[PDB]
Amino acid sequence: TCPFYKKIPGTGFTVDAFQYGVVEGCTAYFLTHFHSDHYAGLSKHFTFPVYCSEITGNLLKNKLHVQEQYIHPLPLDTECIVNGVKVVLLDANHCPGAVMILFYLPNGTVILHTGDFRADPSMERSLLADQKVHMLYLDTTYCSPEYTFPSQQEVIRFAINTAFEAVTLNPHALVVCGTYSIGKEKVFLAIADVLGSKVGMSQEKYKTLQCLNIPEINSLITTDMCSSLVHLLPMMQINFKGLQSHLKKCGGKYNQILAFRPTGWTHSNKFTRIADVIPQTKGNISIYGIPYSEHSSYLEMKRFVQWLKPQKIIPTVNVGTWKSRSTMEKYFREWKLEAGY
Ligand code: NI
Numbered sequence: 001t002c003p004f005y006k007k008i009p010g011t012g013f014t015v016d017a018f019q020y021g022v023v024e025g026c027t028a029y030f031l032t033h034f035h036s037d038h039y040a041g042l043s044k045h046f047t048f049p050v051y052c053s054e055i056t057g058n059l060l061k062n063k064l065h066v067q068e069q070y071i072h073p074l075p076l077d078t079e080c081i082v083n084g085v086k087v088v089l090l091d092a093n094h095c096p097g098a099v100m101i102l103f104y105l106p107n108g109t110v111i112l113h114t115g116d117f118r119a120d121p122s123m124e125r126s127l128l129a130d131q132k133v134h135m136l137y138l139d140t141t142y143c144s145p146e147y148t149f150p151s152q153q154e155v156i157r158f159a160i161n162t163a164f165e166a167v168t169l170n171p172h173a174l175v176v177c178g179t180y181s182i183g184k185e186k187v188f189l190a191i192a193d194v195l196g197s198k199v200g201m202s203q204e205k206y207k208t209l210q211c212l213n214i215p216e217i218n219s220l221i222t223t224d225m226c227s228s229l230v231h232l233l234p235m236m237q238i239n240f241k242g243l244q245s246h247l248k249k250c251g252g253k254y255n256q257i258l259a260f261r262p263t264g265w266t267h268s269n270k271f272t273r274i275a276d277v278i279p280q281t282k283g284n285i286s287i288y289g290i291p292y293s294e295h296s297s298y299l300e301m302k303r304f305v306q307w308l309k310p311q312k313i314i315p316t317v318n319v320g321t322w323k324s325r326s327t328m329e330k331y332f333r334e335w336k337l338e339a340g341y
Contacts, residue, residue, distance in 0.1 A: 005137060005314050008113070010105045011085055015113050015137070018042045027083050032115025033098035034059040035181055042066060051082060053089060055097025058211040059182070077127060090126050092117040094294045095183030096212045102127065112308070113137040114316075119296040119304035128308070136310035140317045141295040143328050147265055148298070149291040150274045156190050158274050159260060159290060163191045166258045167229065174254040175230045176246065177262070178238035182208060183294050184262045189220055191260075192230040200228030226253070235261065240282045247285075256284045262292040302335055309341040 006017040012027030018041030023029075031052040032038060042050070044065040049072055052060065057073035060066040074080050076089050076099070086104040094116045103111040112133050149155075167173050175195070177188040192199045199221050201209075206223050214220075222228055233246065238261045247257055268277075269291055279286040296304065305313070313332050318324040 003319075005316050005319065008103055008111060010107060010109065011103065012083055013085075013103070015101065016115070018046075022048075030101055030113075031056055031060075032101065032113070033092070033095055034063075035095065035116065035183075038116075039064070046070060051087075053097045053099050055211065055213055056099075058213075059097065059208070062211050063208065088127055090123070090128065093120050093123075094118060095181070096185065096214070097182075102133075109134050111135045111137070112310075114139045116141070116294070117296060118294055119300040121303070123304065124307055133308055133310050135312045135314065136305070136308060137314045137316055138301075138305070139295060140301070140315040140319075140328055142265065142293075142298055143301060143315070143318065143331060145298045146270060149265055149269055149293050152186065152292060154274050155290055155292045156186055158277065159187055159288075160190050160194045162288065163258060164194045166256075167195055170256055172254050173229075173256040173258055174247070174250065176238070176243060176257055176259040177230065177232055178235040178260065179205065179232050180235040182212070184292055185209070185212075185214070187260060187262050187290070187292055188230060188232055192220060192228075195229060197229045198222040198224075198227065199230045199232060200225040201232040205232055225250075229254075238287060240285055240287075243285050243287075257286070259285070259287045261287060261289045263289050264293050264295060265291060302331075305332070306335055306339040306341075309339065 002014065002017050002020040002023050006014050008015065012025060013030060014023055014026050015030045016032055016038040017023055017029060018039060028049050028051055031050055034056050042064050044067065046066055047070060050070055051072045051074060054073045057071045060071055061068060074089050076091060080087055088102040089099040092098040092100045092115050098115060100115055100117060101113045110131055110133050114137065116139050163175050175191055188199050201221065203223055206221060209217060209221055225231060238259055243257050243259055247254060266289055277288065279288045315328050
């Protein structure tokens with residue numbers, strides 16, 4: 001059945017609730033972003049109103065073949081009325097098209113649903129600054145103090161510098177980046193830009209990127225793999241077997257692979273700095289795991305919540321175990337005692 005944390009009280013609305021069939025009483029289904037755990041259930045046969053960003057709407061129409069008459073895209077940072085209720089969509093700093101949703105209930109209650117987000121101080125000067133928020137439905141993915149990671153800027157500097165050094169030393173090296181969903185596009189785009197190359201990819205991935213409103217995208221991506229020295233492959237294929245096989249297919253154009261896997265967090269974060277990261281190597285193949293996150297670190301999450309000062313927090317991630325739920329509740333109490341709300 002649909003969990004309580006996907007239902008918005010006092011309304012006919014659900015959030016990211018497409019895998020439960022017809023949810024009784026639901027008059028409008030919101031979709032925060034185009035990631036599969038959130039869209040699961042949508043297809044060309046869906047016939048209820050879906051509310052989302054413009055980018056998410058492009059992906060629904062073109063990738064899932066949802067009919068246009070049921071897609072309701074909303075502009076960002078703009079007050080809109082949906083089934084008699086005022087809503088605002090805000091940038092979530094997650095993947096392209098990802099939003100947080102503010103709901104203004106008829107009775108005076110104000111609710112923020114973060115979707116998936118990476119909290120940033122720039123959010124402290126959006127439309128959030130303009131009123132009190134009573135209830136917060138929070139992306140708690142990394143809600144534990146062991147989860148530190150660097151800024152996105154520091155991780156990109158590392159990737160650019162590593163790729164540029166490798167290809168300048170060996171002009172016959174190929175760079176490969178893994179992907180399995182939208183998000184983390186800066187990794188492969190920034191490397192291609194430093195090397196003066198387009199990024200080569202499958203037709204399916206090219207289609208996906210053409211839906212994202214990225215400026216000058218025709219200038220950065222291509223389906224002509226032969227003309228490119230940065231290739232995108234499925235994340236599954238970023239291992240020694242899969243990369244050896246890919247190198248065979250390039251027909252002696254290249255003699256080395258430098259590959260990147262842009263994972264969220266991996267335990268080496270606890271004891272290491274970004275400057276100190278090293279690859280796994282076998283023969284003429286090296287693989288770097290880089291901690292590029294599109295979710296809040298523990299400290300970023302803490303700062304956001306202590307700034308917002310909500311009356312009630314409802315976690316949306318790690319809710320399946322009593323130990324996880326107890327742990328998160330202890331942190332929320334700490335944060336409230338420190339800040340004084
Ligand atoms: Ni996501």
